[PDB]
Design a protein around this ligand. Structure first.
Ligand SMILES: CCCCCCCCCCCCCCCCCC(=O)OC[C@H](CO[C@@H]1O[C@H](CO[C@H]2O[C@H](CO)[C@H](O)[C@H](O)[C@H]2O)[C@H](O)[C@H](O)[C@H]1O)OC(=O)CCCCCCCCCCCCCCCCC
Ligand SMILES: CCCCCCCCCCCCCCCCCC(=O)OC[C@H](CO[C@@H]1O[C@H](CO[C@H]2O[C@H](CO)[C@H](O)[C@H](O)[C@H]2O)[C@H](O)[C@H](O)[C@H]1O)OC(=O)CCCCCCCCCCCCCCCCC
Ligand code: CLA
Ligand code: CLA
Ligand code: CLA
Ligand code: CLA
Ligand SMILES: CCCCCCCCCCCCCCCC(=O)OC[C@H](COP(=O)(O)OC[C@@H](O)CO)OC(=O)CCCCCCCCCCCCCCC
Ligand SMILES: CC1=C(/C=C/C(C)=C/C=C/C(C)=C/C=C/C=C(C)/C=C/C=C(C)/C=C/C2=C(C)CCCC2(C)C)C(C)(C)CCC1
Ligand SMILES: CC1=C(/C=C/C(C)=C/C=C/C(C)=C/C=C/C=C(C)/C=C/C=C(C)/C=C/C2=C(C)CCCC2(C)C)C(C)(C)CCC1
Ligand SMILES: CC1=CCCC(C)(C)C1/C=C/C(C)=C/C=C/C(C)=C/C=C/C=C(C)/C=C/C=C(C)/C=C/C1=C(C)CCCC1(C)C
Ligand SMILES: CC1=CCCC(C)(C)C1/C=C/C(C)=C/C=C/C(C)=C/C=C/C=C(C)/C=C/C=C(C)/C=C/C1=C(C)CCCC1(C)C
Ligand code: OEX
Ligand SMILES: [Cl-]
Ligand SMILES: [Cl-]
Ligand SMILES: [Fe+2]
Lengths: 451, 36, 334, 62, 341, 37, 82, 30, 30
C-alpha cells in the first residue's frame, strides 16, 4: 500500500497516475516507459510502411506519413522525389524499434523495482516540484538537448548530404545547403509576419536556406537558455506570477503542445517546402490551382484565347486580377492565388501569371504535374473513398495532408482542454479549495450582497 | 459461487467482442458490400 | 496604496455587480465592437459580394430582408483569408461591398468569447470555487471557432464561414452536407447523441427532482415557494427519486450519488459537442463522412442502391445548384 | 550464410518474446529477486549480442 | 382475496425488474418492435417496395440497413399478416413491408405501456408523476412523425424508414420538399433541444464546481451520502457566480429543475405541431414579398432565394430514385444545374 | 517491401504497430486484477 | 437493497454457470451461422441472393404497383428470373 | 413599416435585459 | 498467411494478460 490505493493516496483508480506526483522514481519509469512507446511506434510503423511500400506509386497514394518525413531529410530519394534506395527507411525503422526495448527496459525497471522516490538515493536526480532552482536546472538541461537536436538538422543539411529541395531545378533533388540564412531580419521577420492570407506567418517559409538558418538560431538560442537557466533562479516578478507545483508545470506544457499542434496542422496543410507535394500530395490550394491550369491548357490547345475569355459572371474564365491587381487563375480558385509551387512559378512574371509564357512556354511536365495534382486533391471519405463527397467508390485515397492535419487538430484541441483543466485545478489546489468549498467559511457568505 | 475470478471473465469476454467486431470491419472490405 | 493597485483591486473586485477581471478588460471592448457593428450591419449594410463574382447578396433589413432572411454576409471570396480591416479599403463603400463587417465582427467576437471563457475561470478562482465551468463552456466556444475560423482556414476563404443570419445558417448546413456528407460522419452523429441526450437527460433530471419535491406548500401556492434561497437542507427526496427511477428501469441503471449524477449531466453534452465541433474542424481538412455510394452490387455487378445512394442523390442536387454562377471547372475542390 | 542469419533473428525474436513476459514477473515477484537477478542479466547480454550479430549478418545477405 | 387482488399482488412484487399491470402492454410490444427491427435490418430487403438493399444479409452495414416503409401502392393499409395483401404468407408480408407497420404499431403501444409504467411506479412509490408527464413529448414526436405525417400523405411510403441513413434521407427530403428549416415550429423545437442540452451541461458543471468539501479526498464523489440532509453544493455561491458572469442566475432550486423539464418537453411538442402541418403540405415554404420582388428584380438575392435554389436541386436530383413508383424520367437537359457542376 | 531476407517476418510486421494500444488495454486488465483499488 | 435474486458477479464467476454456457452460447452461434450458411434465411424472409435481384438483361426494378394484386405481382416477378 | 417593427421589438428586448439584471428581485438568504 | 498474422497477434495479445496472471499466482506485487 505504498500509495497505490484510494485510501492512502486520495485519488481514485481512474485518476491513479495522480498517485505518482510525489514519487519521483516511479514517475521517471512512467515517462521512460512512455518514451519507450513513442520510439516503438516510430519503429514499428516505419517497417509497416516499408513492408507496404511500392516504389512505382506516389507515396501519397499509399497512406504513408513517416517515410515522407525520411525522404524530406534526403535519404532514399533522387531527382523528382524518385525512391532510389529503400535501405535507409529500413534502418530508421529498426533502430528506433530496437532502442524502444532499452527505453522499455529502463522504464519498467524504474516503475516497479527501482526506488519509488529518488531523493535519498542521490541528491542530483531527486527533485521537489517546489525547488525553483532544481526545476529550472532540469529545464535548462532539456533546453540544451533540444538545441543540440536543432543543430543535428543543420548538420544533416550542410555536412551529411543535404535535404530534399522541391524548389531545386529539374523537378527537385536532394541538395546540400551551404549558405544558410543568418540575417535575423529574415529569420525573425517570419515571426512578425501576419498569420493571414498572403503572409502566413512562419508557415510561409519557402526555401531551405531559411529553414536551415532558422535551426541554427534556434539551436543556439536553446543551448544558451539552457545555460541561463541552469545557472539562474527565477526573479521576483516571475515568482509572483506563476504557480509552482507539479500540476501547474504540466498545464504550462499542455498549453505549449496545444499551440504547437495547431501550428503543425497549418504547416502540413499549406506548406509545400518542408512537406514536399512529391511526397505528401498536393496542398488543397495547389490541387485547386492545378485544375484551373489543366483546363486552361486544354482549351488553349483547342484555340481559346484564354486571356480575353469572359466567363458568365463578367470575370475572366481562366485569368482575372487579384484585388491588388496580380494576374491569377479565375473561378472559385481566386481564393487560392497566394499558392506558390515549383510547377507554376515558371509562368509567373512581375504582374502575376504572364500571358506570353502561358501562350508559349508550358512544358509537358507542367501539364502532367497539374493533371496529377488536380486528381490527387486532398478530398476523401473517412473510409478512404477519394474525391468529393458525391463521388462513387473506385479510388482508394485520402491525402496524407488530410490525415496529418485532421489528426493534429483533434490532438491540439484536447491538449488545450487539458491545459484549462490542469491549469485551473493547479490554481485551486495551490489556494487550497480544489476539493470544494469550506462550509464553515464559505467566502461568498462574507461578501456584501450585489444588490 | 465465485470460483472463476471476475477480472478473468472480463478479459475473456472483451477479447470475445473485439474478435466479432474486427470481423465485421473485415467484412466491410470483403465480399458483399465492399464495392468490389 | 498607489494608483495601479487601486485599479487592479477594482478590476478584480468581487463586489462589482458584473465581474470585470483581466480577461474582462479584453472581453468588454471586443464584444462591444462586435455587437455594435453587427446590429448596424444587420439593419442597414448594403449588399455584399460573398462569392467574389460581382453578384452581391442582400442581407440587411433595410435592403429587403426580414428577421429570418437577413444576415451579415461573409466577406468576398476574392479576399480569401486575407486580413481586411477597414483601413485596408480605399473607402467604407468598398469595405461594405466586399463584406468587411463580417471580418470585424467575427474576430472581435471570437476574441471576446475566448475571454468570456477565461473570465469564468477567473471569477471561480476569486470566489473559492472549483474551476471547470469554463471547461464546459469550451464545447460551445470550440463549435463557434469551427464554423467561423477553422472551416474558412481549411477551405481558404472566409467566404465559406458561416453567415451571421438565420437563413444564412441553413445555407451553410446544406452546402456542408453536399460537400462533406456530414450526416454520415461519426463525429456529428456523436454531436446529435450529445444534444438529444442532453435534452433527454435535462428533462429526466428536471422531472425526477420535481417529482420528489418535499410537500412544503398548499395547493393554492406555487410549489416553488417550498424552497428558500440559501436554505440548509435539500428540498427533494433523492432516495425517493432513485426508488422511482431504479424501479422504472432497474436499480443500478439509476444514480443514488448526487455528485456522480451531476457529473454525468455535465459530461454527456460537453463531450458530444466537443466531438461535433471536432467534426466540423476536421471536415475543414476534407476528411469527410463515410461514402457508401455504389457499395452494394449484385452477382453481375449492377448497382443495388441503398439508403446511402438516396442520400447521395440529394447531395448531388445541393452540389450542382449552390453558387450556381461561381464554378468554371468541373470539380468543386474547395 | 542465409540460414545462420535467420537462425539468429529468431533467437532474437524468441528471447524478446521470453524476456517480455519474464522481466516484469521477475521484477514484481518478491521471492526470487536473487534467483532471477542472474537470469535477466544474461538474457540482456544475450539480447544485445544477438542484435549485434543479426546486425552484422544483415550485411552478408542484405 | 379475489383472484384479481391475488394477480395484483404478484404483478406489483418488488423484483429486479418490476412488471405491473402496465407490463402486460409494455413488455410484449417493446420486445416485438425491438425484435422486428433487429430481424428486419438483419435479414429483410426493401427491393420490392423501394428498389433498395436494406439488411446485413444483403451487404448493408449498420448505417445503411433499414426496415423500410411499404410501397406507396399499399396506401395506409395496416398490412396485417392475415390481411388481404399478404393473406397470411409471412415471406410475402416481409417483402411487402409488413415489418414496418409491425414495428410502428407495436412501438406505439409499447410507448403507451412505458408511460403507464411511469404512472404505475410513481403511484406505488408515492412521488408526483412529472416524469410521466415529461415522456409526453417523445410520444408527441413519435405519433406526429411516424403516424400522422404519413396518414396525411399518399401512404406509409413517405413516413420515415427505421434506419440510420434512412432517417438522414428523411431530413433531406424535409429540407427539399417542405423547406422545414424555415418553419417556426421546428425552430422552437431546435431551441428547446439545444437549450435543453445547454441546461443539462451548465447545471451539471455548476453543481460539480460549487461542491462543499465534505470529505478529504481528491475524488469528490465519495463525499456524498444519499440519506444526508444537507445540499451537497452551494446555491448561494452558484447564484453569485452566475449573477456576476451572466447578469442573472437561478435562486430557486425547484424552479430550476422545473425549468429543466419544461424547456426540452415544450420544444419537442412545438416541433410536433409543425409536422402535423407538413402532413398536409401546409409548409412555411416561401415569403411572398421576397418572391414578388425577386421575380421582378433580377438583382435581388438573399440567403432565402439561394436556399430555394438548393431545394430545387434536391427535388429534381433525388425524386426519380426516391419515389420510384412515380416512374419519373428527367432527361439530362431538364435537370437544374449551375455552371460547370 | 522489406528486404527479401526479412520477408518471413511480414505478418509479424503487419501487427507490430497496434501493439502500443495493448498497453492501454493491459492497464485495465491490471486494475481489474487489483479490483480498482 | 436486495430484491432477493442471485447476484450476477456470483453467477458468472460460478463454474456451474460456465459448464452450462460453454455449450449453449457457441451452439446458438452455430445455429445462426447455419441459418445463413444453409441459405435458409433467404427463403424464410424473401431476401434476394446476389444472383436474383435482376433478370439477366433487365435493368428495371420489380416494384410492387398494386395493393391487392401485390402478393401475385411478386410471384410473377420471381418467375421471370428463370 | 416592417423594418421599424422588427427594430422596435429588438429594442424592447435589450431594455428588458437591462431591467432584468439591474432591477431584479434581489436574492436574499431567508 | 493471414493465419500467420492472426497467430502472431494471438500470441502477442495473450502475452499481456499472462503477466498479470503469473504475478497473481505468485502473490506478486500487482
Ligand atoms: C496565447 C496565444 C494567443 C494568440 C492570440 C493572437 C494571435 C492571433 C492569431 C490569429 C490566428 C487566426 C488566423 C489564422 C488564419 C490563417 O491564415 O492561418 C493560416 C496560417 C497560414 O496561412 C497561410 O499561409 C500560406 C503560406 O503558404 C505559402 O508558402 C508556402 C511555402 O511552401 C507554399 O508555397 C504556399 O503555396 C504559399 O501560399 C499562404 O500565405 C496563405 O495565404 C495563408 O492563408 O497559419 C498560421 O499562421 C499558423 C497558425 C494559425 C493559427 C492557429 C489557429 C488556432 C485555432 C484556434 C483554435 C481555437 C480552439 C478552440 C478554443 C476553445
Ligand atoms: C396521442 C395518443 C396516440 C395514441 C396512439 C395509438 C395508435 C393507435 C393506432 C393508430 C391507427 C392508425 C391507422 C389509421 C388508418 C387510416 O386512417 O387509414 C387511412 C384510411 C383512408 O384510406 C386512404 O383512403 C384514401 C382516400 O380514398 C378514397 O378516396 C378516393 C378519391 O380518389 C377514392 O374514392 C377511394 O376509393 C376512396 O377510398 C386513399 O384511398 C389512400 O390510399 C387510403 O389509404 O382511413 C381509415 O382507415 C380511417 C379513417 C378515420 C380516421 C381515423 C382517425 C385516426 C387517423 C387520424 C387522421 C387525421 C390525421 C391525418 C391528418 C392529415
Ligand atoms: C521550454 C522553454 C522555456 C521555458 C518553459 C522557460 C521558462 C522560463 N523562463 Mg526561460 N528561456 C528559454 C526557454 C524557456 N524558458 C530560452 C530558450 C531562453 C533564451 C532566450 C530563455 C531566456 C530566459 C530569460 C532571460 C528569462 C527566462 C525566464 C523564465 C521564467 C519566466 C518565463 C516567463 O515569464 O514566461 C513568459 C512570460 C511573460 C510574462 C513574458 C511576457 C512577454 C510577452 C507577453 C510574450 C512574448 C515575448 C517574446 C520573447 C517575443 C514574442 C515573439 C513573437 C514575435 C511571436 C520561466 C521559468 C525569466 C526568469 O525568471 O529568469 C531566470 C527570465 O528573466 N528565460
Ligand atoms: C503509458 C501508460 C502508463 C504508464 C507508463 C503508467 C505507469 C504507472 N502507473 Mg498508471 N495507469 C494508466 C497508464 C499508465 N500508467 C492508465 C491508462 C490507467 C487507468 C486504468 C492507470 C492507472 C493507474 C493506477 C490506478 C495506479 C497507476 C500506477 C502507476 C505506477 C506503478 C504501477 C505499478 O505498481 O504496477 C504494478 C503492476 C504490475 C507489476 C503488473 C505488470 C506491469 C508491467 C509494467 C508490465 C510490462 C509489460 C511489458 C511488455 C514488459 C516487457 C518489456 C521489457 C523487456 C522492456 C507506474 C509508474 C500506480 C501508482 O501510482 O502507484 C503508486 C497506481 O496505483 N496507474
Ligand atoms: C531520463 C532518463 C533517465 C534518468 C534521468 C535516469 C536516472 C537514474 N537511473 Mg535510470 N534508466 C534509464 C533512464 C534514466 N535513468 C534507461 C533508459 C534505462 C535502461 C537502460 C535505465 C536503467 C536503470 C537501472 C537498471 C538503474 C538505473 C538507475 C538510475 C539512477 C542512477 C543512474 C546513474 O547515475 O547513471 C550514471 C550515469 C552515467 C554513467 C552516464 C552515462 C549514461 C548514458 C550512457 C548517457 C548517454 C546519454 C545519451 C548520449 C543521450 C541520448 C539518450 C537517448 C534519448 C537517445 C538514477 C536515479 C540505477 C538505480 O536507480 O539504482 C538504485 C539502476 O540500478 N536506471
Ligand atoms: C400487449 C400485447 C399485444 C398487443 C397490444 C398487440 C397489438 C397488435 N399486434 Mg401483436 N403480438 C403480440 C402481442 C401484442 N400485439 C404477441 C405476444 C405476439 C406473438 C404471437 C404478437 C404477434 C403479432 C403479429 C404477428 C402481428 C401482430 C399485429 C398486431 C396489431 C393488430 C392486432 C389485431 O388486429 O388484433 C385483433 C385481435 C384482437 C384485437 C383481440 C381482441 C380480444 C377479444 C376477442 C375482444 C372481444 C372480447 C369480448 C367481445 C368481450 C369479453 C369481455 C372480457 C371480460 C372477457 C396490433 C398492433 C399485426 C401487425 O402488427 O400487423 C401490422 C400482426 O401481423 N402481433
Ligand atoms: C448506470 C448506467 C446504465 C447501465 C447500468 C450499469 C450497471 C452496473 C451496476 O451498477 O452494477 C452491476 C449490477 C449489480 O449486479 P450484482 O449485485 O450481481 O453485482 C455486484 C457487483 O458489483 C460485484 O462485483 O448488475 C446489473 O444490474 C446487471 C444488469 C443486467 C440487466 C438485465 C437487463 C434485462 C432487462 C431489460 C432492461 C429493462 C427494461 C426497461 C424497462 C422496460
Ligand atoms: C509501466 C506500466 C505500464 C506500461 C508499460 C510500458 C509502456 C511498457 C513499455 C515497453 C516497451 C516500449 C517495450 C519494448 C520492447 C521492444 C522489443 C521487445 C523489440 C524488439 C525488437 C526486435 C525483436 C526486432 C527484430 C526484428 C528485426 C531486427 C528486423 C525486422 C524483423 C524484426 C522486427 C522481427 C502499464 C501501463 C502497462 C501498467 C502499469 C505500469
Ligand atoms: C526554426 C525555423 C525558423 C525560426 C524560428 C524562430 C526563430 C522562432 C522563435 C520562436 C520564439 C521567439 C518564440 C516565442 C514564444 C513566446 C511565447 C509563446 C510567449 C508566451 C508567454 C506567455 C504564455 C505568458 C503568459 C502570462 C501572461 C501574459 C501574464 C502573466 C501570467 C502569464 C505568465 C501566464 C523559421 C521560422 C525562420 C524558419 C523555419 C524554421
Ligand atoms: C457494436 C458494439 C460497440 C460497443 C460495444 C459493444 C460490444 C456493445 C458492441 C456490440 C454490439 C453488437 C454487435 C450487437 C449485436 C446485437 C444483435 C444483432 C442483436 C440481436 C437481437 C435480436 C433479437 C432479440 C431478435 C428477436 C426477434 C423477435 C422476438 C421476433 C419477433 C417476431 C417477428 C419480428 C415477426 C413475426 C414473428 C415474431 C416472433 C412475432
Ligand atoms: C479488464 C476489463 C475491465 C473493464 C472492462 C473491460 C471490458 C474493458 C476489460 C477488458 C479488457 C481487455 C479486453 C483488455 C485486453 C488486454 C490485452 C489483450 C492486452 C495485451 C497486452 C499485450 C502486450 C502489451 C504485448 C506486448 C508485446 C511486445 C512488447 C512485443 C514485442 C516483440 C516485438 C516488438 C518484435 C517481435 C518479438 C516481440 C517480443 C513479440
Ligand atoms: O463558396 Mn461557398 O462553397 Ca466550399 O466548395 Mn467551392 O467553395 Mn464555394 O463551392 Mn462549393
Ligand atoms: Cl449557395
Ligand atoms: Cl471553378
Ligand atoms: Fe440537479
Amino acid at each position: 500500500a505504498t500509495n497505490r490505493d484510494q485510501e492512502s493516496s486520495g485519488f481514485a483508480w481512474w485518476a491513479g497516475n495522480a498517485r505518482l506526483i510525489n514519487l519521483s522514481g516511479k514517475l521517471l519509469g512512467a515517462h521512460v516507459a512512455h518514451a519507450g512507446l513513442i520510439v516503438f511506434w516510430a519503429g514499428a510503423m516505419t517497417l509497416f510502411e516499408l513492408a507496404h511500400f511500392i516504389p512505382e506509386k506516389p507515396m501519397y497514394e499509399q497512406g504513408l506519413i513517416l517515410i515522407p518525413h525520411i525522404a524530406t531529410l534526403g535519404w532514399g530519394v533522387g531527382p523528382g522525389g524518385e525512391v532510389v534506395d529503400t535501405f535507409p527507411f529500413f534502418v530508421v525503422g529498426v533502430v528506433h524499434l530496437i532502442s524502444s526495448a532499452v527505453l522499455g527496459f529502463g522504464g519498467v525497471y524504474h516503475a516497479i523495482r527501482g526506488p519509488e522516490t529518488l531523493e535519498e538515493y542521490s541528491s542530483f536526480f531527486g527533485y521537489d516540484w517546489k525547488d525553483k532552482n532544481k526545476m529550472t536546472t532540469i529545464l535548462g538541461f532539456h533546453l540544451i538537448v533540444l538545441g543540440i537536436g536543432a543543430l543535428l538538422l543543420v548538420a544533416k543539411a550542410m555536412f551529411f548530404g543535404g535535404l530534399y529541395d522541391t524548389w531545386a531545378p529539374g523537378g527537385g533533388d536532394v541538395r546540400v545547403i551551404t549558405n544558410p540564412t543568418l540575417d535575423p531580419r529574415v529569420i525573425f521577420g517570419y515571426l512578425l509576419k501576419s498569420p493571414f492570407g498572403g503572409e502566413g506567418w512562419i508557415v510561409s517559409v519557402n526555401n531551405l536556406e531559411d529553414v536551415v538558418g532558422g535551426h541554427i538560431w534556434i539551436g543556439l538560442i536553446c543551448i544558451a537558455g539552457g545555460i541561463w537557466h541552469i545557472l539562474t533562479t527565477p526573479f521576483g516578478w516571475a515568482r509572483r506570477a506563476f504557480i509552482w507545483s507539479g500540476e501547474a508545470y504540466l498545464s504550462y506544457s499542455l498549453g505549449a503542445l496545444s499551440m504547437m499542434g495547431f501550428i503543425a496542422t497549418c504547416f502540413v496543410w499549406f506548406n509545400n517546402t518542408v512537406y514536399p507535394s512529391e511526397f505528401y500530395g498536393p496542398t488543397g490550394p495547389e490541387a485547386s490551382q492545378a485544375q484551373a491550369m489543366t483546363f486552361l491548357i486544354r482549351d488553349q490547345k483547342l484555340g481559346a484565347n484564354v486571356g480575353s475569355a469572359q466567363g458568365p459572371t463578367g470575370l475572366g474564365k481562366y485569368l482575372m486580377r487579384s484585388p491588388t491587381g496580380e494576374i491569377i487563375f479565375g473561378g472559385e480558385t481566386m481564393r487560392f492565388w497566394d499558392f506558390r509551387g515549383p510547377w507554376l512559378e515558371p509562368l509567373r512574371g512581375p504582374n502575376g501569371l504572364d500571358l506570353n509564357k502561358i501562350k508559349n512556354d508550358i512544358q509537358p511536365w507542367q501539364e502532367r504535374r497539374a493533371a496529377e495534382y488536380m486528381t490527387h486533391a486532398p478530398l476523401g471519405s473517412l473510409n478512404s473513398v477519394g474525391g468529393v463527397a458525391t463521388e462513387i467508390n473506385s479510388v482508394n485515397f485520402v491525402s496524407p495532408r488530410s490525415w496529418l492535419a485532421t489528426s493534429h487538430f483533434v490532438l491540439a484541441f484536447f491538449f488545450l482542454v487539458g491545459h484549462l483543466w490542469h491549469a485551473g485545478r493547479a490554481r485551486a489546489a495551490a489556494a487550497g479549495f480544489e476539493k470544494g468549498i469550506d462550509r464553515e467559511s464559505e467566502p461568498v457568505l462574507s461578501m456584501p450582497s450585489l444588490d | 459461487g465465485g470460483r472463476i475470478p471476475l477480472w478473468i471473465v472480463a478479459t475473456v469476454a472483451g477479447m470475445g467482442v473485439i474478435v466479432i467486431v474486427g470481423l465485421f470491419f473485415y467484412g466491410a472490405y470483403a465480399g458483399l458490400g465492399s464495392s468490389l | 496604496a498607489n494608483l495601479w493597485e487601486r485599479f487592479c483591486n477594482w478590476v478584480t473586485s468581487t463586489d462589482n455587480r458584473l465581474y470585470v477581471g483581466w480577461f474582462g478588460v479584453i472581453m468588454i471592448p471586443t464584444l462591444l465592437a462586435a455587437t455594435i457593428c453587427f446590429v448596424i450591419a444587420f439593419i442597414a449594410a448594403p449588399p455584399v459580394d460573398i462569392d467574389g463574382i460581382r453578384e452581391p447578396v442582400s442581407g440587411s433589413l433595410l435592403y429587403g430582408n426580414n428577421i429570418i432572411t437577413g444576415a451579415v454576409v461573409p466577406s468576398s471570396n476574392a479576399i480569401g483569408l486575407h486580413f481586411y480591416p477597414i483601413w485596408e479599403a480605399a473607402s467604407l463603400d468598398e469595405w461594405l461591398y466586399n463584406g468587411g463587417p463580417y471580418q470585424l465582427i467575427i474576430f472581435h467576437f471570437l476574441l471576446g468569447a475566448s475571454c468570456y471563457m477565461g473570465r469564468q475561470w477567473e471569477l471561480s478562482y476569486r470566489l473559492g470555487m472549483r474551476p471547470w465551468i469554463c471547461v464546459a463552456y469550451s464545447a460551445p466556444l470550440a463549435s463557434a471557432f469551427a464554423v467561423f475560423l477553422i472551416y474558412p482556414i481549411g477551405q481558404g476563404s472566409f467566404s465559406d464561414g458561416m453567415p451571421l443570419g438565420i437563413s444564412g445558417t441553413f445555407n451553410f448546413m446544406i452546402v456542408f452536407q453536399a460537400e462533406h456528407n456530414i450526416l454520415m460522419h461519426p463525429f456529428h452523429q456523436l454531436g446529435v447523441a450529445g444534444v438529444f441526450g442532453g435534452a433527454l437527460f435535462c428533462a429526466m433530471h428536471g422531472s425526477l427532482v420535481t417529482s420528489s419535491l418535499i410537500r412544503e406548500t398548499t395547493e393554492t401556492e406555487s410549489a416553488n415557494y417550498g424552497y428558500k434561497f440559501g436554505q440548509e437542507e435539500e428540498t427533494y427526496n433523492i432516495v425517493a427519486a432513485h426508488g422511482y427511477f431504479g424501479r422504472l428501469i432497474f436499480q443500478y441503471a439509476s444514480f443514488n450519488n448526487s455528485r456522480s449524477l451531476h457529473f454525468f449531466l455535465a459530461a454527456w453534452p460537453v463531450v458530444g459537442v466537443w466531438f461535433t465541433a471536432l467534426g466540423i474542424s476536421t471536415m475543414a481538412f476534407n476528411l469527410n463522412g463515410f461514402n457508401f455510394n455504389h457499395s452494394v452490387i449484385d452477382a453481375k455487378g449492377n448497382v443495388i442502391n441503398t439508403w446511402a445512394d438516396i442520400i447521395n442523390r440529394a447531395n448531388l442536387g445541393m452540389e450542382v445548384m449552390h453558387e450556381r454562377n461561381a464554378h468554371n471547372f468541373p470539380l468543386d475542390l474547395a | 550464410m542465409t540460414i545462420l542469419f535467420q537462425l539468429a533473428l529468431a533467437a532474437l525474436v524468441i528471447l524478446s518474446f521470453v524476456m517480455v513476459i519474464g522481466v516484469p514477473v521477475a521484477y514484481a515477484s518478491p521471492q526470487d529477486w536473487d534467483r532471477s537477478k542472474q537470469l535477466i542479466f544474461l538474457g540482456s547480454g544475450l539480447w544485445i549480442a544477438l542484435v549485434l550479430v543479426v546486425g552484422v549478418l544483415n550485411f552478408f545477405v542484405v | 382475496r379475489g383472484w384479481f387482488d391475488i394477480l395484483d399482488d404478484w404483478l406489483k412484487r418488488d423484483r429486479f425488474v418490476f412488471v405491473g399491470w402496465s407490463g402486460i402492454l409494455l413488455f410484449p410490444c417493446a420486445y416485438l418492435a425491438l425484435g422486428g427491427w433487429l430481424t428486419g435490418t438483419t435479414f429483410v430487403t426493401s427491393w420490392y417496395t423501394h428498389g433498395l438493399a436494406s439488411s446485413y444479409l444483403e451487404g448493408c452495414n449498420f448505417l445503411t440497413v433499414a426496415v423500410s416503409t411499404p410501397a406507396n401502392s399499399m396506401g395506409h393499409s395496416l398490412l396485417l399478416l392475415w390481411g388481404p395483401e399478404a393473406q397470411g404468407d409471412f415471406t410475402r408480408w416481409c417483402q411487402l413491408g409488413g415489418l414496418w407497420t409491425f414495428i410502428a404499431l407495436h412501438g406505439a403501444f409499447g410507448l403507451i405501456g412505458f408511460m403507464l409504467r411511469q404512472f404505475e411506479i410513481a403511484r406505488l412509490v408515492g412521488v408526483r408523476p412529472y416524469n410521466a408527464i415529461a415522456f409526453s413529448a417523445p410520444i408527441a414526436v413519435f405519433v406526429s412523425v411516424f403516424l400522422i405525417y404519413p396518414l396525411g400523405q399518399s401512404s406509409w411510403f413517405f413516413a420515415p424508414s427505421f434506419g440510420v441513413a434512412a432517417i438522414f434521407r428523411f431530413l433531406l427530403f424535409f429540407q427539399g420538399f417542405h423547406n422545414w428549416t424555415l418553419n417556426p415550429f421546428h425552430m422552437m423545437g431546435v431551441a428547446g433541444v439545444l437549450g435543453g442540452a445547454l441546461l443539462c451541461a451548465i447545471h451539471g458543471a455548476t453543481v460539480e464546481n460549487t461542491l462543499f468539501q465534505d470529505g478529504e479526498g481528491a475524488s469528490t464523489f465519495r463525499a456524498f451520502n444519499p440519506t444526508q440532509a444537507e445540499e451537497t453544493y452551494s446555491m448561494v455561491t452558484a447564484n453569485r457566480f452566475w449573477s456576476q458572469i451572466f447578469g442573472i442566475a437561478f435562486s430557486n432550486k425547484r424552479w430550476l429543475h422545473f425549468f429543466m423539464l419544461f424547456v426540452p418537453v415544450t420544444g419537442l411538442w412545438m416541433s410536433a405541431i409543425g409536422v402535423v402541418g407538413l402532413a398536409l403540405n401546409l409548409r412555411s415554404y416561401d415569403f411572398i414579398s421576397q418572391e414578388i420582388r425577386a421575380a421582378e428584380d433580377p438583382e435581388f438575392e438573399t440567403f432565402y432565394t439561394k436556399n430555394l435554389l438548393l431545394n430545387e436541386g434536391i427535388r429534381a436530383w433525388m425524386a426519380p430514385q426516391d419515389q420510384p413508383h412515380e416512374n419519373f424520367v428527367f432527361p439530362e437537359e431538364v435537370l437544374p444545374r449551375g455552371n460547370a457542376l | 517491401k522489406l528486404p527479401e531476407a526479412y520477408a518471413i517476418f511480414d505478418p509479424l510486421v503487419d501487427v507490430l504497430p497496434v501493439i502500443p494500444v495493448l498497453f492501454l488495454a493491459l492497464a485495465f486488465v491490471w486494475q481489474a486484477a487489483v479490483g480498482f483499488r | 437493497g436486495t430484491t432477493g435474486e442471485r447476484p450476477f458477479s456470483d453467477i458468472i464467476t460460478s463454474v456451474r454457470y460456465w459448464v452450462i454456457h460453454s455449450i449453449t452460447i457457441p451452439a446458438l452461434f452455430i445455429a445462426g451461422w447455419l441459418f445463413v450458411s444453409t441459405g435458409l434465411a433467404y427463403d424464410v424472409f424473401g431476401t434476394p441472393r446476389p444472383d436474383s435481384y435482376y433478370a439477366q438483361e433487365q435493368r428495371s426494378i420489380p416494384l410492387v404497383t398494386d395493393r391487392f394484386e401485390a402478393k401475385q405481382q411478386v410471384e410473377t416477378f420471381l418467375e421471370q428470373l428463370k | 413599416m416592417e423594418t421599424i417593427t422588427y427594430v422596435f421589438i429588438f429594442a424592447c428586448i435589450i431594455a428588458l435585459f437591462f431591467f432584468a439584471i439591474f432591477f431584479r428581485e434581489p436574492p436574499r438568504i431567508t | 498467411e493471414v493465419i500467420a498474422q492472426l497467430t502472431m497477434i494471438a500470441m502477442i495479445g495473450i502475452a499481456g494478460p499472462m503477466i498479470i496472471f503469473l504475478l497473481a499466482v505468485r502473490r506478486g506485487n500487482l
